């Protein structure tokens, strides 16, 4: 990894870190609501440990 590659990798990684995404918000605040609702309509109830 010469210097040019080193910066390139760094730029790519920080690009991945910086891009906005709603996925974490959906998981923490929205997904549990959907799971709770769906858990009551299937014939087979959820089996968990």
């Amino acid at each position: 990894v010469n210097d040019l590659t080193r910066r390139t990798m760094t730029g790519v990684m920080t690009a991945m870190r910086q891009v906005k995404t709603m996925t974490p918000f959906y998981i923490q605040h929205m997904c549990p609501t959907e799971l709770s609702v769906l858990a009551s309509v299937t014939v087979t109830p959820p089996f968990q440990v």
């Binding site: 309509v41 299937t42 014939v43 087979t44």
Partner: protein, 94 residues
Amino acid sequence: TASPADTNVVPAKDAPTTNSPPSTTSPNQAAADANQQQAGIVSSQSGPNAVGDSAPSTSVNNDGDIITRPTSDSIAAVANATKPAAVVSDPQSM
């Protein structure tokens, strides 16, 4: 929208042993492999998880024996092997 096929999913009849191939060598391992391959998993992606597992098979009796035909037939076979003639013909019979 409200597709029943996605809501009424339950195990099919004869589920625990349906995929078992007919063999006598290692029925439980063979059945386990058949289930794994049937489910769409490929060995190269399951990795070490595929080596030791075993699953129930039709070739295995409830008592834990290797069977090649339904157990009733086995009962029938031994029963038929012993059927003395009901009426015999001998000179001294009164």
